[PDB]
Amino acid sequence: HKCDITLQEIIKTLNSLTEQKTLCTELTVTDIFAASKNTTEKETFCRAATVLRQFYSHHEKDTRCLGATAQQFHRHKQLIRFLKRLDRNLWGLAGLNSCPVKEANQSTLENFLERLKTIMREKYSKCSS
């Protein structure tokens, strides 16, 4: 289970996510990576999933994010769809919902997604030859 292709699903989705920016992607999320890091792999996944669920829940219909143009609206819908897809995969990996996140620091969603991508690529690297 630890080295399941779900890791590839998460990475591919993070790649799609980090290739769009926006007013939306500068809005913030609680920075689970600001911890001094006393945390199981499963607890990290639950944490990341929780904050991302907070984000897409809060901003799916946010007027700052919805967009004026057809293109901006499309990219918003794509962001929300990909955040849900990423979240679905993260919860599947976590096998958990009870993971309080206590961090004060907020980071932009963009910065949080890049950090998560780094962590996930490292996991992938640690799984393969």
Residue numbers in the entry: 1 to 129
Kindly provide excerpts from the paper associated with this entry.
Interleukin 4 (IL-4) is a pleiotropic cytokine that plays a major regulatory role in the immune system. This intermediate ligand receptor complex then recruits one of two possible low-affinity receptor subunits, the common gamma chain (γc) or the IL-13Rα1 chain, into the functional hetero-trimeric complex to initiate signalling. The overall structure of IL-4 comprises the known four-helical bundle in up-up-down-down topology, which like the crystal packing is unaffected by these mutations.
The structures of the IL-4 variants T13D (max. resolution 1.65 Å), F82D (max. resolution 1.7Å) and T13D-F82D (max. resolution 1.8Å) were refined on the basis of the structure of wild-type IL-4 (max. resolution 1.8Å); all crystals were obtained under identical conditions, allowing detailed comparison. For comparison, in the structure of wild-type IL-4, the hydroxyl group of Thr13 is hydrogen-bonded to the main chain carbonyl of Glu9; the side chain of Arg85 is moved outward towards the solvent and fixed to the hydroxyl group of Thr13 by a water-mediated H-bond. The change in side chain conformation of Arg85 becomes clear if the side chain torsion angles of the wild-type and variant are compared. The χ1 torsion angle of Arg85 is in the trans conformation (174° IL-4, 176° IL-4 T13D) for both proteins; in the case of IL-4, χ2 of Arg85 is slightly off trans (160°), whereas for T13D, the torsion angle χ2 of Arg85 is in the trans conformation (176°). In contrast, in our current study, the temperature factors for the side chain atoms of Arg85 are of similar magnitude in the high-resolution structures of wild-type IL-4 (mean 23Å2 for side chain from Cβ) and its variant T13D (mean 20Å2). Arg81 and Arg85 of IL-4 form several hydrogen bonds with residues of IL-4Rα; however, these interactions do not seem productive. Therefore, the conformational entropy is not decreased for Arg85 in the formation of the T13D-IL-4Rα complex, whereas for wild-type IL-4 the side chain of Arg85 becomes ordered only upon binding to IL-4Rα.
